[PDB]
Design a protein around this ligand. Structure first.
Ligand SMILES: [Ca+2]
Ligand SMILES: [Ca+2]
Ligand SMILES: [Ca+2]
Ligand SMILES: [Ca+2]
Lengths: 326, 338, 333, 340
């Protein structure tokens, strides 16, 4: 029936979309959300997660943990919409009651560890984590819970393989922002899938066609929600066109959750992935032996039908969210 | 009056000596001991700490935390050989740490258990809270990644590094640094107040001579001749290797020097500098590279703030003062064992 | 007006094609060829250059220098080097190397890696503005030259087949062979004040494919005049074809190095952008990566990069190439 | 009898002393001197070598080659180069460089970094066993040579002032100047199959000090014959003395490079051990570190999966320091006699 999972992310407009998908998807049973540094500081990402939840009427249900603020050994490096309402009507974070805290100042990076460890122990086979930001939190967890590595399955939006990078020439943001984390994870015995590398996500575009379907599914039920999801969806659009050459912008992170929902739409290959850490201009490069034992599965492309299947999934969820907001 | 401090270490024969010094010293008020990987796995070091405590009649008083098992981004027989621990093992009291934590038994101990306890101490600290580190510094790097803001309120006093002499386990680096150099690199750039209190520079001049041995016997055989055998077996355990591998007629005693700094810093020379820890280097990771020589050459072009104090040498009297301190404590321990 | 230039290369089937283009092109006035390690050892590449020349009736005219055998600070990575074809005749009818007379040598055993240095330096001193070098192998020879002639850097212009920029690499995930095989060389060159163009990165050369259409035009232009030459150029052209299909996914294989010479002949068919290129040397899995700030450009440059041909460029390239092959076929007869 | 050798160096006050030793030593038959970047630019070092020669009445005999100006893949860290002394006379009475006639050049502007290559290659081919090179600056020239003459590597023996092993470095915390200034060169050399001795690491040279005792012996041997030469050699010898005291802690300064030539003259005064030496190149703060497996071999010699590639001289045998200084002062005496 449905899969227990946790979300680690840095919302982020795509992470907001992925949260929406995972939560409202009946197929995924989200246990918690951990936030990490990346786009913004972990403090802002934490709030951005809670905003996503509160917008979709779930902030009283799902605990959000505020995670680690910087990479293991390196320095660090939700607009379009007014959050003032979502902010002041924000319910208390279930995480605080779990932890014994009175308020959010007491939240610490390692709060999610005990909760994850219950889930992992409970897991029949392996417990599922969707990661769509830096993977510092999981590296940290594994340094504290080495033995849990073999019982964790990870499904990530991260990497570029057969195409070049985004924020640096040959690497993708989530990897390069803390490459030791992913290197650590990959050699930890974790079961790791690169479910949504640039290879795929750059073929998953918010066209005006996709926009009309969103309007189709949501304006009927909640035309306020329509404005919001579209403003968000088009927010880094000009940069994507001008900086990167995208007439229409990609939507990265929900693809990762879609893998866990419906992996039949993805191609898969096992290989050995090396993460560049020593490299001066190339740290975060995902270098495979495709084109040493295998250590990851890589999804290089969707099967035919996959794009439509993804968008039907995504628009369904948006429709259901629009209905609840009303 | 006396200094509240915590001990992070990997016993280890010297760490055992340092624990003895810090605990029995009236000047230091040991709040807890955190153990780390190094010599042995963190699991063995943890037990080795508890053995040290139980030998000296303190295992019921001081909580011991079992810390992180491997370096941040790198790979890692009892750990306390020469001696039979079977008695100290079976008469071991419950770990105060478990009651603090809400655990029933030691299987529940996790690497990050000490974090909350350290954070109370640091918040409580008037100025800064003191940590003596004599193993890898993974635990503190980990702590600081979770408590960045606490960095400015922690003072660290370490047995680590070589500066004006070469290394031990590798040509130009010392064990505790090279075993996790990112940890120390992290710590040093975190805004922690850091002293290299006991680098090889000093500890290699702190030697367990037959003279020192006779004084130990002098102070302990009268009160507990069993304890005498034990402390001497331990003290001479890596002695042949130190002679043959390294050229030491008499072996050094490293880690208690670090605790001695916190007890009595007047016996040490000190210089501030900028220390860079080699991490990129293939044969040289863990090298403590200072700008001490740049500052003589041309102090006016130094574009890097100091970040550590380095103790390059003891003042005259320091060695005697160290050994009087150490032998006093051993004497007092011998009296309690009886 | 035709351009005095020198060729540094590691033939290599493409380098053989580039040599053919440059020599027989009236627009380029080839002064010498220096060979380097890469595909094969520099000794085999040296002979492969002489074979190219002797096949096209030029081995008595142009001096060939045998250059450096390994990278500056790295080990080499890597048949004859020019397989698919029988060289026994071209080998035994090989005329004496003009280089030996230039150098005062009796035979080829006397050739040394640094023999081209004095000859290049005359050309560079003579140059009105800058002297042109086409490089389509490792760039060890030029790095070496520049370490001996630092001051000549500002008077040398380089036009290279090297790099990948907006697409991934070939022999390694994100780097191209010629760069990664000695990345310190290119790093050295780029910070030397040399005027450098990446004229033919994978970005372009992967869109320059030996189709069966191109093959028929070759046959068209050559079989009439010399059907032996036809067999040879086609065997060579299809020699790493299966690997290109199976290893790399190419129905039809790319032809890299002649694109570099084509830049020097007719740069109007190429787009160009100036940027700062950093060559990865520290990187463990990524050495030889050409990392530019092209995308950072929203707000010093050291190279020009040609990311793509203008429309017409591919046709223009192939007309150029087939012309030359035709002219070669006529001379062999 | 006597050993054919070549000198590669960056004078430099010590290199000047080493040149004096090698040339005037009957035991060494100096074929040429190649200069390299280091202390100064290779152009100044080149002239500093010619000045050394002309001072000692040899500039008309020995060819001096001007070599490579920068490291293989790094920037230089590059005064006359030979300060404390007025060279205006030695400069204007300088005879033509024998190198120019060898090369077919009219003047010195024609000198190029790779001029010594052909001359070295004749010597190496001629060599019965191996040909000897004393290197006391950066080793860029030899790395360059070997990149052009790979096959000659097995017939070259190198005796160097370079490195620190069981003590720390000088110009950087754990490395010595000559290595760190171009570490890829030495790395290249060591893996080329060259027979390499670290004859004079800091380990030794830091125990070879120009005391006031040594100074008086110099005066003893030279003032009788040429009191002008006395002033010069002493000014030179004390020129970086204050820095050595203040920057580095030396009451009396070390004299590095002649120790290397002394090895080739009289190796019986040195201890020797074979090991595998790795040169740090990747390291950010530690490039140029000479990292040996000497300690691995005491710990567990049976696990060593790397062949030895160098001899290291960690120390002089007893008598070695006296023997060195008698050698050095003899030569200075003989030089003083010729200058008159
Ligand atoms: Ca994200
Ligand atoms: Ca220890
Ligand atoms: Ca080529
Ligand atoms: Ca020198």
């Amino acid at each position: 029936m449905s899969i227990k999972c946790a979300l680690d992310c840095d919302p982020g407009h795509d992470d907001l979309a992925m949260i929406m998908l995972a939560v409202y998807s009946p197929k995924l049973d989200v246990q918690y959300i951990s936030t990490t540094h990346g786009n913004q500081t972990v403090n802002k990402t934490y709030q951005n997660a809670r905003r996503t939840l509160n917008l979709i009427k779930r902030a009283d249900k799902i605990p959000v943990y505020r995670g680690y603020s910087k990479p293991l050994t390196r320095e660090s490096v939700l607009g379009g919409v007014d959050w003032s309402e979502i902010d002041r009507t924000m319910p208390r974070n279930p995480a605080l009651d779990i932890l014994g805290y009175k308020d959010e100042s007491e939240l610490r990076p390692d709060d999610f560890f005990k909760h994850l460890h219950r889930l992992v122990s409970a897991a029949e086979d392996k417990f599922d984590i969707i990661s769509t930001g830096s993977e510092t939190n999981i590296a940290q967890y594994l340094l504290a819970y080495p033995e849990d590595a073999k019982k964790i399955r990870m499904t990530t939006m991260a990497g570029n393989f057969m195409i070049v990078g985004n924020i640096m020439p040959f690497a993708e943001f989530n990897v390069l922002i803390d490459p030791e984390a992913i290197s650590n994870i990959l050699q930890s015995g974790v079961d790791y899938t690169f479910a949504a590398p640039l290879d795929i996500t750059h073929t998953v575009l918010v066209t005006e066609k996709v926009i009309n379907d969103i309007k189709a599914a949501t304006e009927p039920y909640s035309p306020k929600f329509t404005e919001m999801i579209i403003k968000l969806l088009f927010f880094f659009k000009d940069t994507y066109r001008d900086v990167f050459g995208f007439i229409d912008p990609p939507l990265h992170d929900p693809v990762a959750a879609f893998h866990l929902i419906a992996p039949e739409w993805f191609e898969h290959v096992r290989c050995h992935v090396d993460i560049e850490t020593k490299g001066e201009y190339t740290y975060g490069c995902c270098c495979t032996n495709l084109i040493k034992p295998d250590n990851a599965t890589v999804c290089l492309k969707l099967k035919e039908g996959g794009h439509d299947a993804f968008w039907n999934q995504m628009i369904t969820v948006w429709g259901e969210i629009a209905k609840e907001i009303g």
